[PDB]
Write a protein that binds this ligand. Structure first.
Ligand code: SO1
Ligand code: GDP
Ligand code: MG
Lengths: 824, 52, 189, 94
RNA sequence: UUCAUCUAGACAGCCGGACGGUGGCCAUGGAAGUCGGAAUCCGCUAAGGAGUGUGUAACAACUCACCGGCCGAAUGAACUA
């Protein structure tokens, strides 16, 4: 029940009565449609399974000060505003899941009795605990565990005892001990039971209430004697903590007879259209029906009876207020790993002693879309401060450090809006610890980022995710002219999604990367008709390797001027990895001092100062790993032609001879320099197709292959899932680098090597190998040398190479150095 | 839901067999020759391929 | 038939020399445990098992080295071997009825007695939790280590042990499916 | 001391950090040997050995889990040689 | 048409062991009898192969050979037409 902006604003002011959590679970456990019924029974109102682009439904309910004697925190209010932000379980769409955790203090988990605690449910439960968030064990779809399976009291309680101990294992391992004992116990009144599609849900505590004195002792001690080793004797009329009598016969556990039994009898009776027994028990539970309510029989019969018996939002929000967290207790030791560097800093202290009137702090993780003037609003949580409709505050970009200036934009917000389900409306204020939606900062911020008033503030924690972009794809247009619109669209997809990593490649294509192939085709779909608006052209990301020689070109190739005068002889030798690597590193620079650069290459990476100090080029563009040295010393016109040489050098070393790619770790050696008399005949106009045609023939006689790009794929995943990984990499030449793990947590973080041409759907085969348990974070490493010799179309890259010439529309296969050679 | 003695008995009459390499038919795992005459009563057999 | 004839002459050698002996029987035993026994007395009590080449040892009882072979042939049946010595029996009887301990729950072995165990924290991290899930036994986490909540009397006396529950009983130091290695007959001079 | 295939028993008592080495068959064939059989073969496969050692390898059998249950000098003549293709001692074990 | 071992105590059969070194030489991102080459050993007895396979990522675990219970005379293996 909300009234108005200010009335809802006044409840907000009390952060002690602010249950701010998220709902995570798994693909099909009934969490999205179940959260729909909670709002339709206790959501929000002010004076008026795929999670397809979600927001954050607010909502607020009523309690009592007597319920407040059981909550261990500093709460003094009775009206509570619970702001629940929707966060899609899955795993190939877990982008919004890591975002919610950080920008909230608590969290709900929709486990199941039948499908139970799944593999992804177990690892998504870890993200919430590895972030220091609190638990809500909601075992739903219990109507199908007693309607389309129908078990016994002691026995169904074992499917639930399993649900208990399964979600329980992720706790004692995939959690943090600073929160204390955050292990959800059903009896402790920390476990939720219920049916979301049929609006009813009850709790352990809910019946401890409707029982206490109707038993004789306090309801707290009794509801702890309701679950576990606890039996009641319908003969001694006493509570014996043994499962048999003074004879040795079977007993229906305390739980089985007091809670279960009634439900069990109600279950059947209503599901068996027997109103000849329905009223009798309908009476023991004080349930009344009138008019078209009793016009519904059997299924619909129990649907409305149990609602009026077990209250939806009520029961889950009973353990959400007396158990689930708010900023007050949460941020108390949550802000530690909510910030980096100075934890004793006064700005992080503002968050610890939550002061809306101090160091303004906020983190926008999401960016709720609505194409108007700019493009859409931002979405963050205030940790220490009140925001206003035009307030001037700074922006800490993903780079920005308190002592520099880059990624720091201090502007005034045009207006503020509070989220109500999916839509919002113009508000002006919101204090420390409450999640808000600040607009007008779209055309400034570069995605997830900080926003603080105090400039001396360091930098917070930049997300986490535990996924990383690994699905690779390339795009184009079916129609040549609409090409520009498609490109500004990747910019749009940047500002319409979280993990989506669009980038450019060495192919002249706009690359697309994401959580999954479904995910991809999902962004592709929301794009094809919206973001793009035209027929694209998708296909695996075209890969370019590097045309490199190695076995030291044995014969000297002959290339003279086009008139046939100035002849130069070259030998192609291999430049050491640590050597060519340093060119691209910024160690051995193309604008560095030769004497000191020679001391560097001679001592550290061993060579003779002669060819070391006489280097000339750094092909291609004078920054790549191709170095040219003068093997001569008696050239009458030494550097009087050095330029024309370095020129044709890069053009040829860039557009390759094998097929058409630049080269890598190759040292061109101008063994002999034979020139003409007059300098006019000795100009670039000849030296170009001479030095170029020289490396052309010298290349095809230096016995070259291709050093291609390798990935440093970090596959952090479960222990028994490791079986599947070994076999998968045992196929795609997976060269597993290391393999270490934390003794306690079974998750074994494993790093390896994977060929670029061996990964066009690689992620997919891993999860299929051992359930969505495996985790591939493919971070390209270096270039690992091959061995096949592509000058013959039997070599692996040999097929690749000819089709690349066939690709560009070239001289078919590889033309011999004889087709473009000089001599008798 | 499976359990040892239960998922074991189930396999004893579905997976614990021997697939003939000519006619494919189900024979006792501890077999040696086929009982069908369309294959000429062959001896070339192979246990029913397991699950990975 | 080569080694069958030489076995005769050899076992014949130790019986023709020593004063007192034991025709010890044992069905349930383990190879590794077995050699620990022969090493338990590598000199005073050297063991020597037998079979049908022991049905001829009764036809070697027909060979009659001494008349005392009468009191020997009526103990040939069951996995029964030998025990050679020349020291006072009470002292060495003490050792053979001290050489008797056994094996655990070999998944699908005999289940004769009642399977009852108490409830105290096991002392190991939550590991075989996926088994107690499809198994259904009340057990909660107490300081990381899995703690026994119920005095679970696992399997009822008289059945065939299930693969799953036997392996977790192994983690519980449960060894009751054998208990072998004693005497079948007692003989001297 | 010891490398290739690790068999090291470790007993713990909540914070109690203590280990007891079982010195496998790998450990004895390299324990008496000098430096080129202790190190320098990182990029090399270990395949040579003949030269006579003797009785002190009987106490080296006491380092290789004494759960064989028989005689010492007797079983040494077995392990080292057939499974031990380096430092064969007496070329009579195969 | 050929060789075993063969009531003395057989094979087909059901009943109890499948070991130490050993997570063997190396070889390993990983390999411990079962991805793998090269070695194919004796302590002991009734016996156990660096091991017959399944399956563990590798361990573990099950199992076969070898050998003890009983069934208790043949009847197994190799070939011809
Ligand atoms: C942080 O995210 C990272 C990782 O996913 C990984 O490092 C990835 O690697 C991309 C490639 C990097 C290679 C080197 C730097 C040299 C060659 C480059 C590639 C060209 O074929 C190979 C891989 C795959 C890409 C081809 C398909 C064009 C690369 C590229 O960016 O061009 O790059 C993204 C941005
Ligand atoms: N049998 C049964 N099905 C349910 C119940 N609640 C929800 N569902 C099913 O759950 C589906 C929606 O799941 P969703 O809410 O997408 O799951 P989530 O993505 O994990 O939140 C619907 O198609 C329903 O059929 C229930 O109480 N009983
Ligand atoms: Mg959903």
């Amino acid at each position: 029940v909300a009234f108005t902006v200010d009335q809802m604003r006044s409840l907000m002011d009390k952060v002690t009565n602010v249950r701010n959590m998220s709902v995570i679970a798994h693909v099909d456990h009934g969490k999205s449609t179940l959260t729909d019924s909670l709002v339709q029974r206790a959501g929000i109102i002010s004076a008026a399974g795929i999670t397809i682009k979600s927001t954050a439904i607010s909502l607020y309910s009523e309690m009592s000060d007597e319920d407040v004697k059981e909550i261990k925190q500093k709460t003094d209010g009775n009206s509570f505003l619970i702001n629940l932000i929707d966060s899609p379980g899955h795993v190939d769409f877990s982008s919004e899941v890591t975002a919610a955790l950080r920008v909230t203090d608590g969290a709900l988990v929709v486990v199941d009795t039948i499908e139970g605690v799944c593999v992804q449910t177990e690892t998504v439960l870890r993200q919430a605990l590895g972030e220091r968030i609190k638990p809500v064990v909601v075992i739903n779809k219990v109507d199908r565990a007693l309607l389309e399976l129908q078990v016994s009291k002691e026995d169904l309680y074992q499917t639930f005892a399993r649900t208990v101990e399964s979600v329980n294992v992720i706790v004692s391992t995939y959690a943090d001990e600073v929160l204390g004992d955050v292990q959800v116990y059903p009896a402790r009144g920390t476990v939720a039971f219920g049916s979301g599609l049929h609006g009813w849900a009850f709790t352990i505590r809910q019946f401890a209430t409707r029982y206490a004195k109707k038993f004789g002792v306090d309801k707290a001690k009794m509801m702890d004697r309701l679950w576990g080793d606890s039996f009641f004797n319908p003969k001694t009329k006493k509570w014996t903590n043994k499962d048999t009598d003074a004879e040795g016969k079977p007993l229906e556990r305390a739980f089985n007879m007091f809670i279960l039994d009634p439900i069990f009898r109600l279950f059947t009776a209503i599901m068996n259209f027997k109103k000849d027994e329905i009223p009798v028990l309908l009476e023991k539970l004080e349930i009344v029906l009138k008019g078209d309510e009793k016009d519904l029989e059997g299924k619909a019969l129990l649907k409305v009876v149990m609602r009026k018996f077990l209250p939806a939002a009520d029961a889950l929000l009973e353990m959400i207020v007396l158990h689930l967290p708010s900023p007050v207790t949460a941020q108390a030791y949550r802000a530690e790993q909510l910030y980096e560097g100075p934890a004793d800093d006064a700005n992080c202290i503002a968050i610890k002693n939550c002061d809306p009137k101090a160091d303004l702090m906020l983190y926008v993780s999401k960016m709720v879309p609505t194409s108007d003037k700019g493009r859409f609003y931002a979405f963050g949580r205030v940790f220490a401060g009140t925001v206003k409709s035009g307030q001037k505050v700074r922006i800490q970009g993903p780079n920005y450090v308190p002592g520099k200036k880059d990624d720091l934009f201090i502007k005034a917000i045009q207006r503020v809006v509070l989220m109500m389900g999916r839509f919002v409306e113009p508000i002006d204020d919101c204090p420390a610890g409450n999640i808000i939606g600040l607009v007008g900062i779209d055309q400034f911020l570069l995605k997830t980022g900080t926003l603080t008033t105090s400039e001396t503030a360091h930098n917070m924690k930049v997300m986490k995710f535990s996924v990383s972009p690994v699905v690779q794809v390339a795009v184009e247009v079916k129609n040549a002219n609409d090409l520009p619109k498609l490109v500004e669209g990747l910019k749009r997809l940047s500002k319409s999604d979280p993990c989506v990593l669009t980038y450019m490649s060495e192919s002249g294509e706009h690359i697309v990367a994401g959580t999954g192939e479904l995910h991809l085709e999902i962004c592709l779909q929301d794009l094809e008709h919206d973001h793009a608006g035209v027929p694209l052209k998708i296909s695996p990301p075209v890969v370019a390797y590097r045309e490199t020689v190695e076995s030291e070109s044995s014969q000297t190739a002959l290339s003279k001027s086009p008139n046939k005068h100035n002849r130069i002889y070259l030998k192609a030798e291999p430049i050491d990895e640590e050597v060519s690597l340093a060119i691209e590193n910024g160690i051995i620079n193309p604008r560095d001092d030769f004497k000191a650069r020679a001391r560097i290459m001679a001592d550290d990476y061993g060579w003779d100062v002669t060819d070391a100090r006489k280097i000339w080029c750094f092909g291609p563009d004078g920054n790549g790993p191709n170095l040219v040295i003068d093997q001569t010393k008696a050239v009458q016109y030494l550097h009087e032609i050095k330029d024309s040489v370095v020129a044709a050098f890069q053009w040829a070393t860039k557009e390759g001879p094998i097929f058409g790619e630049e080269m890598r770790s190759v040292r061109v050696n101008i063994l002999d320099v034979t020139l003409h008399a007059d300098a006019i005949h000795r100009g670039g106009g000849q030296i170009i197709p001479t030095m170029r045609r020289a490396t052309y023939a010298g290349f095809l006689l230096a016995d070259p292959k291709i050093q291609e790009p390798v990935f440093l794929v970090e596959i952090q995943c479960p222990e028994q899932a490791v079986g599947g990984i070994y076999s998968v990499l045992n196929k795609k030449r997976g060269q597993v680098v290391s393999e270490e793990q934390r003794p306690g947590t079974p998750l074994f973080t494993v790093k390896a090597y994977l060929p670029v041409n061996e990964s066009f759907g690689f992620t997919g085969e891993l999860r299929q190998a051992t359930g969505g348990q495996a985790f591939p974070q493919m971070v390209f490493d270096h270039w690992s040398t091959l061995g096949s010799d592509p000058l013959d179309p039997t070599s692996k890259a040999g097929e690749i190479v000819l089709a690349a010439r066939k690709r560009h529309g070239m001289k078919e296969e590889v033309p011999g150095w004889q087709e473009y050679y000089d001599k008798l | 839901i499976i359990e040892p003695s239960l998922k074991a008995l189930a396999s004893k009459y579905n997976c614990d067999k021997s697939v003939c390499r000519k006619c494919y038919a189900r024979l006792p795992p501890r077999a040696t020759n086929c009982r069908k005459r369309k294959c000429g009563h062959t001896n070339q057999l192979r246990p029913k391929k397991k699950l990975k | 038939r080569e080694k069958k004839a030489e076995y005769f002459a050899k076992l014949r050698e130790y019986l023709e020399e020593y004063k007192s002996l034991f025709v010890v029987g044992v069905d349930n035993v383990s190879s590794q445990q077995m050699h620990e026994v022969r090493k338990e007395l590598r000199g005073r009590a050297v063991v020597l098992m037998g079979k049908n080449t022991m049905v001829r040892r009764a036809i070697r009882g027909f060979l009659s080295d001494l008349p005392d072979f009468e009191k020997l042939l009526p103990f040939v049946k069951g996995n029964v071997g030998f025990v050679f010595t020349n020291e006072p029996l009470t002292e060495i009887k003490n050792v053979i009825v001290s050489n008797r301990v056994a094996a655990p729950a070999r998944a699908g072995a005999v289940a004769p007695e009642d399977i009852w165990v108490r409830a105290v924290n096991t002392g190991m991290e939550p590991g075989k939790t996926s088994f107690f899930q499809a198994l259904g036994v009340p057990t909660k986490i107490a300081r990381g280590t899995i703690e026994i909540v119920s005095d679970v009397k696992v399997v009822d006396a008289g059945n065939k042990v299930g693969q799953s529950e036997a392996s977790l009983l192994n983690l519980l130091n449960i060894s009751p499916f054998t208990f072998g290695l004693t005497v079948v007959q007692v003989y001297d001079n | 001391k010891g490398i290739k295939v690790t068999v090291q028993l470790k007993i713990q008592n909540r914070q109690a950090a203590a280990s007891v080495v079982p010195s496998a068959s790998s450990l004895v064939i390299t324990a008496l040997k000098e430096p080129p059989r202790d190190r320098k073969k990182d990029k090399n496969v270990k395949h040579s050995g003949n030269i006579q050692l003797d009785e002190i390898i009987e106490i080296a059998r006491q380092m290789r889990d004494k759960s064989f249950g028989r005689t010492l000098a007797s079983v040494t003549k077995e392990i080292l040689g057939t499974a031990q293709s380096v430092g064969c001692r007496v070329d009579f074990k195969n």
